Amino acid sequence: FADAQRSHYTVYPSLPQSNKNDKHIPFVKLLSGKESEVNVEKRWELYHQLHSHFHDQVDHIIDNIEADLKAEISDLLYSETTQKRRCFNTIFLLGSDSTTKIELKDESSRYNVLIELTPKESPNVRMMLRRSMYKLYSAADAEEHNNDVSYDLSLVENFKRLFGKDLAMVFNFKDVDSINFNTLDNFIILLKSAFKYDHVKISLIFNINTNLSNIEKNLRQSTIRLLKRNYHKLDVSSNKGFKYGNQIFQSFLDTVDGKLNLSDRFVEFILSKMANNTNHNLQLLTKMLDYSLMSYFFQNAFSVFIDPVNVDFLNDDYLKILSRCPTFMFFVEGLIKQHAPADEILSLLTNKNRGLEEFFVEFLVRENPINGHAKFVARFLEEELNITNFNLIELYHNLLIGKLDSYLDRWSACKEYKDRLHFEPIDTIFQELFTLDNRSGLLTQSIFPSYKSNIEDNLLSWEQVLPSLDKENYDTLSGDLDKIMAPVLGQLFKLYREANMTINIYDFYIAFRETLPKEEILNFIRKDPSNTKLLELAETPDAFDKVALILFMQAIFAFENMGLIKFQSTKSYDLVEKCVWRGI
């Protein structure tokens, strides 16, 4: 109708008043629909306890990097002078994204203002000056507890006699790699004349997200020699000095200490996806670990057994599920192959439910500390050895594999400690229902998918998305069409893939016209009982082409706004250009 013709129509969905059930949580009935409702409620509450215990530590680390950074910047912003006294202090914040709040100290009988500047707040030099002096007059006349001045450096000249305090303005350029440096060095030149006023103290703070050889290549050399008077650098990045990856991954183990385990493939996938992204890694760490936890409690019924009170709700289907673990198969093969007691394996094979039901609850008192010993290796490398360039994720990966000694000899600094820093752990039976893992490609398919490859796969093959049927063909309208005829927009792509770079739309139409059935669609087209217009065009002696051009032009103008087809030669639109290739 006409409601999908206007943008942003808000819609209130009306609702039935109540259904009076427990359907207030999304956790479905697992074990092919055999689970109890109280176990689903306990699973939801247990997942929320785990998720809250994780994120209450993640938030303290994330709100502690700001209390570390404000402590860092505000120490080399102050407590130092230069003998020239006609220079501005300059701090290059390397690798920093513009997300930090800066605090300026008391320093009484002197104002301290912070003038944040942006590539949107700087289209030329005069808007920078008007915004800077506007922020100066605002943060000077509102921090005092009346005339109108002009917003230029004259306010900086007579700031001493307008207010009575000395000025100390601290500039702050947010995306220094995104401003014009031609506007920025003009602003620095325009600021340089403020030196002669004896009550100012300009400080510049550059938030650079690239290296320093790309800022002093684009600036002019006189501005660079002015900036070489009192400059300091400061590396602000959460990959330098692995302290905040060794506090998010450390805190993830404090929630899963004994209840859950991590796989080998999972930690190497974490390391592969944390290394292909540098700007934000404290967020791509947490949104992989939480989505690993969310795909666990939604899938694994045995999560209800990670609390040692729910041990008595072992139904028959839990005993069916746990029995077909291959580590238990390895254990039972062990009980066969070393010695032969008959009537114990005959019990625990398929008959006795009580022995297997009480046997599994012994397997939860075990700890086998991977994450209980890895903190000892972390404390040994940080305190006793004083090496602060190690990664807890990669050390944990090698400790999980077992080649930890190679990673400890990667430094060649702890040769007398390769026995003290050694730990060879084994597997405990029934790990493979209690492990966070990725062997199905779930964290790949729904966090970092091959987007274009999935679109092209669904366009080309299309049988992995559309079903085939064997009963619903006679009550339908097209029963014999789903088996002999590919879907248009999925059939045209088979000709689009094996075409050239320049595709003539008439040849692209003829190749589509002779891959359709002729003697089927001329029978099919007369099926409709209601309308009468669709049958008279079948009484026309050129029905097949006039039904073929409709489907072809529909598929072409459907590909075009998807991105696979560029119509070159405007005012012709006859020779299209293939512009997406499969497999790339």
Add this chain to the structure above:
Amino acid sequence: TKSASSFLDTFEGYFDQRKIVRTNAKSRHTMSMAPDVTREEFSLVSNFFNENFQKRPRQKLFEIQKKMFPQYWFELTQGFSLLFYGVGSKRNFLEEFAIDYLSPKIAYSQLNSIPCLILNGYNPSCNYRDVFKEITDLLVPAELTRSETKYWGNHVILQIQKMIDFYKNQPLDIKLILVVHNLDGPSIRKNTFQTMLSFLSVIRQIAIVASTDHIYAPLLWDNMKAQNYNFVFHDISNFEPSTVESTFQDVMK
């Protein structure tokens, strides 16, 4: 047959099919010799073939992916945004998911319903100032004061930043479900709209349920946009005939 390509589609399929073809080997055939139709014959056979070619397999597919809905509600209520890419129209999926399923389940669980702001982003008349006008009466936030507004700044982006720092001291319940159809459409792929919709997804109290159509879509979002969205991607390609949106675009002869 009409392509002499040694390789097919990889990087060497790109390098191989980009050759140079002579003037006599070319086929300069205008599409005038295609048998012309009327507008109403197209309009008739189109709506016939939409719901009468693969109708029961597509309904079977929608019932297959319709038991996926509790995972979508779980991912929304745990903080993520959703992104539904795929072949075909994702329109009726989000009209049958967000209106029917989602907001009744959200409204019951925190105990009228939860307001659903649909946003037809395939319409090129999609300004962000009237869309943010439509957001600021479904939430009604505070106004921009004199100290918090700046010298000729953007009031929409500053208001969303003020809402972001307001909603860190609040209970975490969904207050709106923002349903964007064709998020990479011709008037919403631009930068300030995406800055708006990326700063809205920072708020936990609004669930973004987006959909894309173009294939080079993920390069609209850098390390700041793709971090404030924190999308989870779901290929729900269901081969829909996509006839709500094609009335907007040119169907010129």
Add this chain to the structure above:
Amino acid sequence: PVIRKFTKKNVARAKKKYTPFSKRFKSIAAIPDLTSLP
């Protein structure tokens, strides 16, 4: 009080009324004789 973004100190406005002739009496049947009005 307030700090303004710019100033318009040299502004001169006329003394001109905003409500038109349609809202003098709001009675079309009782419009007085406009010719010999003072």
